Each structure stands twice: as structure tokens, then as C-alpha cells.
């Protein structure tokens, strides 16, 4: 367990325990007796609310719902599934990060004739406005988007709004990294796409130079794209422009390690040998600003120096 900071409270939970224990006992007796009925669902509802990682109880609920579908009318089965959706949503409100709860909802939705996928996408938008880093919810959203055949372009528009309204942005940039290649496929991004993305990420990290997610995504863009060093005039110019903007930022934020690393990477992308002197100077400044990464930075520099020897020997 995580985040547990170190009589009435202590005796209340001695009471919780004893009810949880009797409820638990009762569920297992009913199950061994083959009593797959609503009273099980009532028993497990009590336990799963507070202890959603009790996986065997989700299995029991599925066993019951499977059984009841056989011997209830269509309308009665429909009522049971709607009650289950409500139960699930009340569980997600108290604990939005439980694998079991998210899976049971998928299991349920996947079985329906029938399913209202637009309503599920909205549920995702709500949970994501509460926690934009909730990977369970993003995973569920991807599941819903696929089931309802939502187009990459629509999901791309969703990521833009999320990135610009705040802040907290790694999950949304990650999603973009998977979406873009789908829009512009291939068995590497097209340059026009790449240039737009660079402009978008560069707004982000000048808007919030702290914001590690834009810098991580920008390093990817710088390699995706390419391609090499057959730099067009436009891309050459854009990268030189980024270089000077990072130098400005360096002056404004002299403890910012992300801009320093990015300057090194930009020079590599532009002209490794012409910028060798400055690359070496930037490595020193960076190690002093980010000493915990000194070993990484020496290894990166050793790699680049080897690349440089290889380039000079191609003369």
C-alpha cells in the first residue's frame, strides 16, 4: 500500500473487518453452494466499494451476471446491466485507479448488443479532467475509441484541447505520438506534419519551460524527422530558429537543464562537426546544472565524439 501517512477509529475498523469478514464468508459459501443470485451482488457491492482489488469478487459478479442472463427475461437482464454500470461508476469515483474495476467495465460493455459508446467517451473525458495522467482511463478511452471506430483525427483534436488548457501533459503527448503515425501511415513522420508538431511543442515548452513532457516529445520529433541531414531550407531554418530560442530561454532560466540538452541535440541535428566546439561547451554547463545525470551525459558525449570521428574519416 501507498501514501499511508504515519480507539473510536481503531474499533470502527474492528467493526468494518468483522462485517467484511462475514460478508466475505457468506459470498464463498453461496458460491460453493452454486447459488448464483442477486444476493451475491448485494454482498460483493459492500466489499468491492472499499476493496476493488479483491479480484475474485469481480469474478463472482461476472459468474452471477452470466448465470442470470440465462434465466431472466431480456428486460430483466437489461436492468441488471444498467445497475452494473451505475455500480461501476460509483466504484470508479472512490478508486479511479483499480485494474479490476476498469476491466469489469470493459468485460461488461464488450458483451452488450447494444453499447452506448458515446456515453463511455464522455465518462473518459470527465475522469480525465479530474486526473489527466490516469493511464487506466486513457487505456479505456483507447478501447472505447476502437470499438466505436472513432477516427485518429477526432482523437487528435481531443489531445490539442487537453494540452493547451493545462499542464500535466505527458499522457496527452504520448497519445499524440501514437495517433500521428496513423493519420500519415507507412509500413518517421512526413515533413509538413513534423513542422506543425514542432511548432506546437515549441509553444508548449516556451509557455512552461518546466514542463518535462514537451521536451521528451520534442526529442522524439527531432529523430522522427529526420532524415537526415538532407535538411530542407525550411527545416534547416526552423531548427536554427529553435536553437536561438533555446539560447534566449537559457538566459531566462539558467537552472533549466532541458533547454541545454535540447541545444546540444539541435546542434547534432544541424551539423555535428561545425558545432563540435559549442557542443563540448554545452556538455560542461549541462553537467554542472544537472550533476545527477553526469554519467549519462559523459556517455552521450562519448557517443557523439565517436560519431564525429566517423564523419571526419569519411572526408
Amino acid at each position: 500500500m501507498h501514501g499511508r501517512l504515519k480507539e473510536a477509529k481503531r474499533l470502527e475498523r474492528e467493526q468494518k473487518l468483522k462485517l467484511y469478514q462475514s460478508a466475505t464468508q457468506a459470498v464463498f459459501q453461496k458460491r460453493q453452494a452454486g447459488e448464483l443470485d442477486e444476493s451475491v451482488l448485494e454482498l460483493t457491492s459492500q466489499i468491492l466499494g472499499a476493496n476493488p482489488d479483491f479480484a475474485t469478487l469481480w469474478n463472482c459478479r461476472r459468474e452471477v451476471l452470466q448465470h442470470l442472463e440465462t434465466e431472466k427475461s431480456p428486460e430483466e437482464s437489461a436492468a441488471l446491466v444498467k445497475a452494473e454500470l451505475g455500480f461501476l461508476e460509483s466504484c470508479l469515483r472512490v478508486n479511479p485507479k483499480s485494474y479490476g474495476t476498469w476491466h469489469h467495465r470493459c468485460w461488461l460493455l464488450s458483451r452488450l448488443p447494444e453499447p452506448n459508446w458515446a456515453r463511455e467517451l464522455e465518462l473518459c473525458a470527465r475522469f480525465l479532467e479530474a486526473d489527466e495522467r490516469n493511464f487506466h482511463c486513457w487505456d479505456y478511452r483507447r478501447f472505447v475509441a476502437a470499438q466505436a471506430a472513432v477516427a485518429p483525427a477526432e482523437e487528435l483534436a481531443f489531445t490539442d484541447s487537453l494540452i493547451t488548457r493545462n499542464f500535466s501533459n505527458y499522457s496527452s503527448w504520448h497519445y499524440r505520438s501514437c495517433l500521428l503515425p496513423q493519420l500519415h501511415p507507412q509500413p518517421r513522420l512526413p515533413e509538413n506534419v513534423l513542422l506543425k508538431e514542432l511548432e506546437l511543442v515549441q509553444n508548449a515548452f516556451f509557455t512552461d519551460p518546466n514542463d518535462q513532457s514537451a521536451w521528451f516529445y520534442h526529442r522524439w520529433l527531432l529523430g522522427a524527422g529526420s532524415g537526415r541531414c538532407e535538411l530542407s531550407v525550411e527545416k534547416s531554418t526552423v531548427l536554427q530558429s529553435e536553437l536561438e530560442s533555446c539560447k534566449e530561454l537559457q538566459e531566462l532560466e539558467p537552472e533549466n537543464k532541458w533547454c541545454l540538452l535540447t541545444i546540444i541535440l539541435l546542434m547534432r541535428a544541424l551539423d555535428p562537426l561545425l558545432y563540435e566546439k559549442e557542443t563540448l561547451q554545452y556538455f560542461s554547463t549541462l553537467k554542472a546544472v544537472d550533476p545527477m545525470r553526469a554519467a549519462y551525459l559523459d556517455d552521450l558525449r562519448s557517443k557523439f565524439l565517436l560519431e564525429n570521428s566517423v564523419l571526419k574519416m569519411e572526408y
Binding site: 464463498f28 485494474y99 552521450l300
Partner: protein
């Protein structure tokens, strides 16, 4: 930026005696009771940490072997506890325990193998159990179980590899399923998977190594992904991954070591997720395992793949080659 600040009277020495006492006494009620859905794994954490500290003898072997046999179901799968349902997670934990005790015979190995085999899907992924949840955690559980049993050939290895590699992301990391965001726990599972299946050459070690070493915060502690708090169990997840891919020196060893020791409770023994939180056997194992990977002499060398003493894995001749 999100980080803890370690206080100046935080423990700065290794309290092995107290940790062994803490684990040896654990389970003599609330949370306990309440975590019974993971008991088999809880047993694995306690036993493994005691073995890394040279104290396994203080636990109850005979009692554990009976418990394990009682947890194997007719399908061959093992549950977390008696009357709970079988799952790949607890099948792995059980097999790790039996390996620690050289008592693999206690369960029906043929049936474990058939259980693992039956959960593989057409795309090469593994469901955790019959209810179909797909996660790269279960890919690792499946191959780690089979490797310890000498039965990796029982599954479709190339398809399994292809699935795991389809979970590789723009940043060099791995998530739960295709399209899922990178997370240190998933990265451990997938790099461990790739070690076992001899596919580490398919990792971009420099890129992933960088993403992993950027998990270290000013406090010295590691988080599991960008913009989260440090937590002692990343001393395991991140450090093990780094070791597998040959980049453990990319972390500041001294700062992390100080962070881990600060997570000890000097009165109760055990480790908590962060300094001054409540201790548990999970964080106790991962704290001790992280210190061993960092080269703590009083702790046995730990496998970064299996999170078990290397001497155990040497005995069963299962030691995957790592990146140099």
C-alpha cells in the same frame, strides 16, 4: 519538481536486524486481512527479502508448502489464497517461492505449464486469467514462470515477443498494452521479458536508459514516470530495468542509497514507500533489493530479472544474459 524533502535525522544506516525481525513477525489484523487477495505474493515478498538477508530459515517452510499446494486449482493455475481464483500473478509468486525452497515437485508442474499456455492469445499477448485482462505484466509472469520451470518452449515465443515489442513507445519505454503510456513497472516487466527471451538487442538502451535515469529526483528517490512523487519501490522497478539494459551507472547511486535508507522505520523496522509513511513487506523487499543492486555488501546479490537471490537462479541454471 514534485519531490519529497528528506529530514536531517532520517536513518542513514542499514538496519538489517530490525528488518528481519519485522518480516519474521509480520502476520501475527486489519490490512493483513484485507490484502488476502494477494497473500501468495505477500508470502513471496517476505521470503525473498529474508533470503536476501540470510534469514530465510526463520520463516515456516513446511507451512508454506502446504499452503501453496492448497492454492493450485484443477486447471493448473495458482490462486493468491485458499478459495480465491487462479491467476498468472500468483502462479508466478508460487513458482518463485518453490524455487527459493527447491520444492517445485510440491505442485503439478505439467498443469502449471498447460495453464500458462492456455492464456496466450492469437496476437501473442497473455490474459491474466480466464476473464481476459491483457497486460504486459502477464507476458512477464508467463515467461518468468516457464523459465523457472525449464518450459519456455511451451508458448509461442515469437508471437509473444512481437506483442511486447508492439507495446514499445516513442520514449523507448513500454506500457500495459499497445498504445499505453510508458511506466516504470511495465518497463521492468517488458525488459525482464526481453531478457528471458534473448531479445534485449531490440531495446533502444540509450533512449530508454535516459528516460529511466530522469526518474531520479533531487531527493535521490526515483519516480515511476514524469511528474510523480518518488517511491521506494522504483528503487526496484527503475534500477532493475537499468541493470537489465546495462545503464545502472546512469543513476546517482549515493543519492538513491540515502533516499532508500531514509524510508526505513527505525522503530518497527521495514521500509515504507517514502520517509515517514507506514512500512509494509512489499516496500521492504524492494528497498532491500534496490540496495543489493547498488552493491550493499551485507545483502545477497539479487537477480534484476527474477527479483530472487542470484545464487538461487544459478542453482536452477536460469540466468539470462543482460546488456553489457
Amino acid at each position: 519538481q514534485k519531490d519529497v524533502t528528506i529530514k536531517s535525522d532520517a536513518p542513514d544506516t542499514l538496519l538489517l536486524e530490525k528488518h528481519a525481525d519485522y518480516i519474521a513477525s509480520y502476520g501475527s489484523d486489519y490490512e493483513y486481512c484485507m490484502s488476502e487477495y494477494l497473500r501468495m505474493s505477500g508470502v513471496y515478498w517476505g521470503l525473498t527479502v529474508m533470503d536476501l538477508m540470510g534469514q530465510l530459515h526463520r520463516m515456516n517452510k513446511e507451512e508454506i508448502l502446504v499452503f501453496i499446494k492448497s492454492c493450485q486449482h484443477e486447471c493448473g493455475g495458482v490462486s493468491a489464497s485458499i478459495g480465491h481464483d487462479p491467476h498468472l500473478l500468483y502462479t508466478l509468486s508460487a513458482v518463485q517461492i518453490l524455487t527459493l525452497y527447491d520444492s517445485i515437485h510440491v505442485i503439478n508442474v505439467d498443469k502449471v505449464v498447460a495453464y500458462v499456455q492456455s492464456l496466450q492469445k492469437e496476437d501473442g499477448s497473455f490474459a491474466g486469467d480466464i476473464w481476459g485482462e491483457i497486460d504486459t505484466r502477464f507476458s512477464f509472469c508467463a515467461v518468468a514462470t516457464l523459465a523457472l520451470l525449464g518450459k519456455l518452449d511451451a508458448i509461442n515465443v515469437e508471437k509473444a515477443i512481437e506483442f511486447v515489442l508492439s507495446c514499445m513507445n516513442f520514449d523507448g519505454g513500454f506500457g500495459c498494452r499497445p498504445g499505453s503510456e510508458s511506466h516504470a513497472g511495465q518497463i521492468y516487466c517488458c525488459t525482464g521479458f526481453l531478457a528471458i527471451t534473448s531479445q534485449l538487442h531490440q531495446v533502444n538502451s540509450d533512449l530508454l536508459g535516459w528516460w529511466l535515469c530522469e526518474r531520479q529526483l533531487p531527493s535521490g528517490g526515483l519516480n515511476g514516470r514524469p511528474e510523480k512523487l518518488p517511491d521506494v519501490c522504483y528503487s526496484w522497478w527503475v534500477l532493475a530495468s537499468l541493470k537489465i539494459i546495462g545503464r545502472l551507472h546512469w543513476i546517482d547511486r549515493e543519492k538513491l542509497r540515502s533516499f532508500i535508507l531514509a524510508c526505513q522505520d527505525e522503530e518497527t523496522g521495514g521500509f515504507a514507500d517514502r520517509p515517514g509513511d507506514m512500512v509494509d513487506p512489499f516496500h521492504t523487499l524492494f528497498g532491500i533489493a534496490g540496495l543489493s543492486l547498488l552493491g550493499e555488501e551485507q545483502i545477497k546479490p539479487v537477480s534484476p530479472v527474477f527479483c530472487m537471490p542470484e545464487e538461487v537462479l544459478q542453482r536452477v541454471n536460469v540466468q539470462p544474459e543482460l546488456v553489457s
